[PDB]
Design a protein around this ligand. Structure first.
Ligand SMILES: Nc1ncnc2c1ncn2[C@@H]1O[C@H](COP(=O)(O)OP(=O)(O)NP(=O)(O)O)[C@@H](O)[C@H]1O
Ligand SMILES: [Mg+2]
Ligand SMILES: [Mg+2]
Length: 273
């Protein structure tokens, strides 16, 4: 198996083995010549100010270390495309887990949600803060051993140097209504986490009844909840989801409110008043 590309630092190789393909990202099999452990050689679809901004953001993502965040090895612009090297995750995501077991056990849902919340609190407390802008169950990877989860797919993330981000990107099912207004903050990762928790409690894509991305845009910007919202059996999970997907960003719960919620700590014994 001869390698077909090499990272600029000379550390990572690319193999012509496609593992997955999405709307803008193709996952190849890569190798870390320092350790000979395989990595993920991901290739994404690509002014000078944005190019210089890109070099600084990659250097900060390159320095992140947190047990609930996939390691960001390197990234650069190639020849028309953006290469992104991260950990080759091989235990499946929370989407493949939901697509397999259909029902997620309540204790499993809370344990993984708390780790996701700790992963989001890490990005939001960086200097400058980092918005994921693409949180969903397929960007949350199960890690061995002990089955801890890490947030990955930082290809759409931004460092918050100003007060607000503007670019309208992400996955429509998980995008906050103010994202289409080109003026939003880190509250969109809470909104997407509300849809992640909705996906884990219903085991389907939110707004699956919509025909395309425009219908999702029309419903969300009108303050209409997805049809799977009223299918949530656990009232505690339903109220938390409602507290995250609120149409007004200023009314939504915060990460600290979620991390301190009495729901994510009920696995200490019986449910008592
Ligand atoms: N780091 C990774 N390690 C292993 N498999 C991965 C990794 N990242 C993505 N994949 C797989 O590759 C598939 C395609 O990647 P994906 O991230 O869906 O592309 P994308 O749609 O362009 N970006 P996204 O917005 O997250 O869907 C996913 O469904 C995963 O199964
Ligand atoms: Mg995808
Ligand atoms: Mg992904």
């Amino acid at each position: 198996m001869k390698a077909v590309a090499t990272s600029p630092s000379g550390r990572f190789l690319k193999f012509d083995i496609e593992l997955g393909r999405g709307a803008f990202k193709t996952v190849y099999k890569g190798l870390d010549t320092e350790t000979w452990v395989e990595v993920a050689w991901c290739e994404l679809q690509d002014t000078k100010a944005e190019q210089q901004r890109f070099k600084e953001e990659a250097e900060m993502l390159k320095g992140l270390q947190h047990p609930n965040i996939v390691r960001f090895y390197d990234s650069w612009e190639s020849i028309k495309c953006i290469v992104l090297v991260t950990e080759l995750m091989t235990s499946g995501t929370l989407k493949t887990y939901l697509k397999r077991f259909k029902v997620m056990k309540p204790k499993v849902l809370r344990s993984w949600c708390r780790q996701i919340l700790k992963g989001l609190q890490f990005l939001h407390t960086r200097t400058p803060p980092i918005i994921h802008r693409d949180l969903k169950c397929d960007n949350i990877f199960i890690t061995g051993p002990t089955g801890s989860v890490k947030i990955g797919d930082l290809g759409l993330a931004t460092l918050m140097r100003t007060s607000f981000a503007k670019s309208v990107i992400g996955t429509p099912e998980f995008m906050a209504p103010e994202m289409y207004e080109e003026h939003y903050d880190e509250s969109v990762d809470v909104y997407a986490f509300g849809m992640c928790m909705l996906e884990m409690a219903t085991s389907e894509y939110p707004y699956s009844e919509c025909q395309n991305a425009a219908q999702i845009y029309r419903k969300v910007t009108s303050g209409i909840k997805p049809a799977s919202f009223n299918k949530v059996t656990d009232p505690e999970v339903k109220e938390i989801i409602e507290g995250c997907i609120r149409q007004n960003k200023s009314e939504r719960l915060s990460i600290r409110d979620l991390l301190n919620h009495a729901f994510f700590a009920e696995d200490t014994g019986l449910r008592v008043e």
